[PDB]
């Protein structure tokens, strides 16, 4: 008869119960305790300036209308019943398009205690906005936020709090990181207030701090450009009479630099300013351009002033590697230490 | 106190008819609109549309929802929206739109004692606007959003902007990676269809494209290849293989640039400014290789005339290329 007793209590709780009214309406502010478990910090898209995250969202509040007495002290509830009671209308301020999973059934859970406390958990995938400053690309670091609050209830009606200390209220799984190109350093948890045309609302915020991995750009951009510059300065050691050899050499290292520069921009988003890679490529391009101008000068002065042409080639064999090594030292000390 | 509210609300919704507009059969119901733009992104030239996220609020008075005895504004659960009458507002140029539904449907209903209803929604919409790209990338665009009632006419419903020019907020905080919003405008008018008149509100933005990306990614490589094609003039004319290889490989590089631009840019079958610049550079390197064709053809019988042609080409080509740049930039900036 335990099942019939429980059924009676279930069929008695919701008698005279209106789910269109929050608990304590007109009497007190509804206090909501929230915590987040991150199961996977998904891919980050630099093109769209957005990121994906999979979370368990846990909310807890008190509803005196749902007190009961029975053999048990905790009740686990089917998701059909969790839609009969009032729940907070929490939404993510910076969300773009989120998915609530219901395979094979809705991934929601609602537990009721005897004193009237309700625990409401759900599984969500959130695609959020992470605006980025790419002036230091690909040696940049970003703070991707996640903000949430009540869509309809002002802070005079509903307020949010973290279940524990804010540091310990957002927990990330050990295998959570699903980042091919970023390194998740940590997160900071805060809470503020926003004002809209409809009122003032409480906002709960979390910031995830990311630092970009640079090895891909090293193997895709920096190494081919360095090899092309070294080849163009290798051109200085061929004899002057080999005119077609040095002309093909210079013009093909210039076309290779042009191809690399055009190739690099595809990864980059369409930004107005110039990244650190734009400057590195522009300097390598200017180096191979000056090496071909140098050969044009040597060929112009050959057969009339061979002494001057030899002096120019001898000084270029020293000046170009020195200036390029100094530029690399400055470049990789200005940006790697930020 | 909560039981009295439950009684009053159930009293109001008892006998309420959703199929009838407020003041049905009498004076038209006036609806005020507010838009709070949250973000604008993905302005697509290929798809010829843009994506907009906003908070859309509607205010109207319904005498059937007036209550007394409670000195409060009642914000109700958004599922009560299915039990009330709401305007049949729609966007005429919307290709795809949806209401956010995490963790619940992003909808709001608020009631006031005099019977005024506030109805809010959080909407992401993709709106189509035609782009005239004859001056691309030095072009300005004007993209709009049209708000209209699907079924009612001006004898039933009326639209106005709530707050005048302050009805739309959040434009000043928008940052676009490629564009910059110059101005926004609000227009109210009626549209005379075959079924009668229809109230309409319009919100338009004017966009001015940024140039730094095209300067550092498109025009500079073509300029540098054009300047490098002039290196041939300082090489001796008997180096036939070097000058031929330089001319035709610079032609091939310019062709590769144009082809890949054709692969990435939107298929817009008319002449733009970028096509004029790329074609002008291609003409300059084509004529530089035809000049070496002439020099190679005459450097044996008349080596002095071929040397004088190369020397004069060292002056004529940079001067005519700077004159071309001056004319191009004056006509487009």
């Amino acid at each position: 008869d335990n099942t019939t007793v429980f059924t009676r209590i279930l069929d008695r709780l919701l008698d005279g119960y209106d789910n269109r009214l929050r608990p304590g309406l007109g009497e007190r502010v509804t206090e909501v305790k929230t915590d987040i478990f991150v199961t996977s910090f998904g891919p980050v898209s630099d093109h769209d300036m957005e990121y994906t995250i999979d979370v368990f969202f846990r909310q807890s509040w008190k509803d005196e209308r749902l007190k009961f007495k029975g053999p048990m002290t905790v009740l686990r509830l089917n998701n059909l019943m969790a839609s009969k009671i009032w729940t907070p209308d929490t939404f993510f301020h910076n969300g773009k398009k989120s998915v609530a999973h219901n395979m094979t059934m809705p991934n929601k859970l609602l537990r009721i205690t005897e004193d009237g406390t309700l625990l409401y958990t759900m599984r969500l995938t959130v695609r959020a906005e992470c605006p980025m400053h790419l002036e230091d690309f690909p040696m940049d670091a970003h703070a991707c936020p996640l903000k949430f609050g009540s869509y309809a209830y002002t802070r005079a009606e509903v307020v949010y709090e973290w279940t524990r200390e804010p540091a310990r209220s957002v927990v990330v799984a050990e295998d959570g990181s699903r980042l091919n190109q970023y390194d998740l350093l940590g997160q900071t948890v805060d809470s503020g207030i926003v004002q809209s045309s409809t009122g003032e609302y409480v906002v709960m915020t979390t910031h995830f701090h990311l630092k970009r991995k640079i090895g891909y750009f090293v193997i895709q951009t920096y190494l081919p450009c360095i090899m092309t510059v070294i080849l163009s300065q290798v051109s200085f050691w061929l004899n002057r009479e080999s005119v077609p050899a040095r002309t093909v050499f210079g013009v093909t290292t210039v076309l290779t630099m042009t191809t690399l520069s055009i190739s690099a921009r595809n990864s980059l988003p369409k930004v107005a300013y110039a990244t650190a890679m734009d400057w590195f490529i522009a300097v390598c391009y200017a180096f191979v351009f000056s090496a071909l101008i140098e050969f044009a000068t040597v060929n112009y002065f050959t057969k009339s002033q061979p002494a001057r042409a030899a002096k120019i080639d001898r000084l270029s064999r020293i000046a170009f590697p020195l200036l390029f090594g100094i530029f690399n030292l400055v470049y990789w000390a200005t940006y790697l230490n930020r | 106190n909560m039981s009295f509210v439950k009684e009053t609300v159930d009293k109001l919704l008892k006998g309420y008819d959703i199929r009838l507009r407020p003041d049905f059969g009498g004076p038209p119901v006036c609806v005020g609109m507010n838009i709070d733009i949250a973000s604008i992104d993905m302005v697509s030239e290929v798809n010829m549309d843009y994506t907009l996220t906003m908070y859309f609020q509607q205010y109207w008075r319904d005498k059937r929802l007036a209550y007394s005895g409670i000195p409060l504004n009642l914000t109700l659960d958004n599922r009560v929206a299915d039990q009330l009458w709401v305007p049949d507002t729609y966007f005429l140029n919307d290709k795809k739109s949806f209401v956010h539904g995490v963790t619940v449907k992003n909808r709001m209903i608020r009631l006031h004692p005099d019977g005024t209803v506030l109805y809010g929604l959080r909407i992401t919409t993709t709106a189509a606007c035609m782009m005239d790209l004859r001056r691309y990338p030095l072009d300005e665009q004007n993209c709009t959003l049209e708000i209209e009632s699907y079924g009612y006419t001006t004898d039933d419903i009326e639209f106005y902007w709530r707050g005048g020019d302050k009805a739309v907020t959040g434009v000043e905080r928008i940052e676009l990676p490629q564009f910059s919003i110059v101005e926004h405008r609000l227009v109210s008018r009626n549209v005379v269809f075959a079924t009668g008149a229809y109230p309409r509100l319009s919100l338009s933005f004017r966009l001015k494209r940024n140039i730094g990306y095209f300067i550092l990614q498109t025009y500079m490589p073509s300029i540098l290849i054009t300047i490098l094609s002039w290196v041939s003039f300082w090489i001796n004319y008997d180096a036939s293989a070097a000058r031929v290889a330089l001319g035709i490989t610079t032609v091939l590089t310019m062709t590769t640039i144009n082809t890949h631009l054709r692969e990435t840019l939107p298929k817009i079958p008319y002449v733009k400014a970028i096509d004029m610049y790329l074609m002008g550079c291609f003409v300059f390197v084509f004529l530089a290789l035809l000049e070496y064709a002439f020099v190679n053809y005459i450097f044996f019988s008349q080596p002095a005339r071929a040397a004088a042609i190369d020397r004069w080409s060292r002056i004529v080509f940079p001067f005519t290329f700077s004159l071309f740049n001056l004319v191009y930039w004056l006509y487009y900036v």
Partner: nanobody
């Protein structure tokens, strides 16, 4: 160059309103977090308030309910309304802008800083 120029400040008689402003130049900070800090004489630099791109307002646990922050995004500026001032509020108020990496409440995460503005409270 980029400069954060600050105005306002001065002295007040243990109360009244005091709106300290901050105007930016040389760079648009629409996508940045603009904040206010406070440095009492010789003690330490203290976080006061901050506002991000989404108009979310953050406040220190000592000035909540007394100081109000705001931003004029069109003019690229930020203001701080000081109300119910106390003698303990006599310090040098700073204006900062940053991306909030590793924390928006820490002073070591802001790229640009103002020249300061003395606020004196007399009782």
């Amino acid at each position: 160059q980029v400069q954060l120029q600050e105005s306002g400040g001065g002295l007040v008689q243990a109360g009244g309103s005091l709106r300290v402003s901050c105007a930016a130049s040389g760079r648009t900070f629409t996508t940045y977090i603009m904040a206010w800090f406070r440095q009492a004489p010789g003690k330490e630099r203290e976080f006061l308030a901050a506002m991000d791109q989404g108009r979310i307002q953050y406040y220190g646990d000592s000035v909540r309910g007394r100081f109000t922050i705001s931003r004029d995004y069109a003019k690229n500026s930020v203001d701080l309304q000081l109300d119910g001032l106390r003698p303990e509020d006599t310090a040098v108020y700073y204006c900062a802008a940053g991306a909030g990496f590793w924390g928006l409440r820490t002073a070591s995460s802001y790229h640009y800083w103002g020249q300061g503005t003395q606020v004196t409270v007399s009782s």
